[PDB]
Ligand binder design. Structure first.
Ligand SMILES: CS(=O)(=O)Nc1cccc2cc[nH]c12
Length: 502
């Protein structure tokens, strides 16, 4: 669970909560209400509260005096299982022992707040299915709530909508009897596990929240208009779901693999990692690269980090093994004086050996937003293994935030798409930035969404947060920021508009 994140709390509200309701080792995280990408970890130690800044400019969560993380849940899991690791400026250990839980329901997928009983019945009738539910404000009884649930199997009376009144009495919630809950989430979780049974026997199964994010692609402009009045609230609802994605990353945690990771705690899930075969028998662990397969759930991707000097050979082994023919690089080699990805390709017209692999740079072509490099990759000693690999190097992404206009990214992805589609039996498209989660996740999700619209036209269903959750189950923290989340919507809107004009 992620109850330690409080989306609508001030610094002083956080201090008072930890002092009145917490103990030493108590903690919570919260966003800054005016600087998105800024978060604070507030921690109680020696009867006083310390506030620790976490910044995310788009690549990773950077904890002051700690490490870089793919998600706030991974950050919290790391320190709740590693004492002595989190430290202040003056060096003392700060311990995260006791999450201080938030009662606020506004980031729950099932919470609709102000909503009429007739509006909720229409939404549940049109969009809902057996077990679809929502919680809304009563309107008749102020301060109380209603849980509306659809149960059932043409509109022939085989299904129905039931309303269950939820009383709020002295900051606890109940359905008219039995247990009184600290929050609506606790109530919903209880009646999700232990469903209410009606007198005549109907089980009110809370199977899934009502789906409000699935839109018809033609109506993207109207959804964007609505979110622009929010994008922040829909993004935070998505982020609340990240506690469901704490999958194991054991291989990346092995001593033999530690120096193959750019950031020690940003690791590939075991269940989707790229496994390298045919390694040097002399190298004890030769099967590991910080990379995952992203299979939308025909075109697949590999999301990976920027090469380290000691992983360039493994990068080319992956490319060769997976039969990838297109690489997308979304960083300059150096940004803000820091190395983001080593040069892993030869100079134009040059030939270099990278371990058992040989690469020729045949030709480079510069466009305004990117450079294309036509590379020839083969195994040393085996001439007939040569294949062309087209590297698309996006060069104009800003150092922080996102492009102001998506036209450049969309023209780049169209060209990448056409190259991939032109090559018979090409493997997954490799996409990498620096950590391989923020820009990489953004480019991949845009590509996935646009691909739907390319095959099905302007009239098909898309669901941005559900697509992002699905990509996040295959590599940690894919899509890092609210700014990238907004950019994904803007890119898809711009794509639909250029398709209508044509
Ligand atoms: C409100 S919703 O349930 O319609 N949309 C939605 C929001 C956030 C995360 C996910 C994952 C699947 N759907 C999501």
């Amino acid at each position: 669970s992620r109850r330690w994140f409080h989306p609508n709390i001030t610094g002083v509200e956080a201090e008072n909560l930890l002092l009145t309701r917490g103990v030493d080792g108590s903690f919570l995280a919260r966003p800054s209400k005016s600087n998105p990408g800024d978060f604070t970890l507030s921690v109680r130690r020696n009867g006083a509260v310390t506030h620790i800044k976490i910044q995310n400019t788009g690549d990773y969560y950077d904890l002051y005096g700690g490490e870089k993380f793919a998600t706030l849940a991974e950050l919290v899991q790391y320190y709740m299982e590693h004492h002595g690791q989190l430290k202040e400026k003056n060096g003392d250990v700060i311990e995260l022992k006791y999450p201080l839980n938030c009662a606020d329901p506004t980031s729950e997928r099932w919470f609709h707040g102000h909503l009429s009983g007739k509006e909720a019945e229409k939404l549940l009738t049109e969009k809902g299915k057996h077990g679809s539910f929502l919680v809304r404000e009563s309107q008749s009884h102020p301060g109380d709530f209603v849980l509306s649930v659809r149960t059932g199997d043409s509109n022939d009376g085989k299904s129905k909508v039931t309303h269950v009144m939820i009383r709020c009495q002295e900051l606890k919630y109940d359905v008219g009897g039995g247990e009184r809950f600290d929050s609506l989430t606790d109530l919903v979780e209880h009646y999700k596990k232990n469903p209410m049974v009606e007198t005549l026997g109907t089980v009110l199964q809370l199977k899934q929240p009502l789906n409000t994010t699935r839109i018809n692609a033609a109506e993207i402009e109207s959804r964007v208009r609505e979110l622009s009045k929010g994008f922040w609230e829909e993004f935070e609802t998505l982020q609340q779901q990240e506690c469901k994605l704490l999958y194991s990353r054991k291989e990346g945690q092995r001593q033999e693999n530690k120096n193959k990771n750019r950031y020690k705690n940003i690791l590939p899930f075991d269940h989707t990692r790229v496994v390298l075969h045919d390694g040097d028998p002399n190298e004890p662990v030769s099967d590991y690269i910080n990379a995952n397969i992203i299979m939308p759930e025909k075109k697949s991707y590999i999301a990976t980090q920027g090469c380290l000097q000691n992983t360039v050979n493994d990068f080319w082994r992956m490319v060769f093994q997976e039969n990838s023919r297109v690489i997308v690089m979304t960083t300059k080699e150096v940004e803000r004086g820091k190395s983001k990805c080593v040069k892993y390709w030869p100079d134009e017209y040059a030939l270099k050996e990278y371990g058992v692999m040989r690469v020729r740079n045949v030709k480079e072509s510069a466009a305004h937003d990117y450079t294309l490099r036509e590379l020839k990759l083969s195994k040393v000693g085996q001439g007939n293994t040569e294949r062309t690999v087209w590297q698309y190097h996006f060069r104009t992404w800003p150092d922080h935030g996102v492009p102001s206009d998506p036209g450049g990214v969309l023209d780049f992805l169209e060209e990448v798409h056409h190259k991939q589609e032109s090559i018979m039996d090409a493997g997954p498209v490799v996409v990498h930035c620096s950590a391989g989660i923020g820009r990489t996740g953004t480019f991949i999700v845009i590509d996935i969404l646009i691909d739907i619209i390319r095959e099905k036209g302007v009239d098909c269903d898309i669901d941005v947060p559900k697509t992002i959750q699905m990509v996040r189950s295959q590599r940690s923290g894919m899509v890092q920021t609210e700014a990238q989340y907004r950019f994904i919507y803007m890119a898809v809107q711009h794509y639909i508009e250029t398709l209508q004009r044509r």
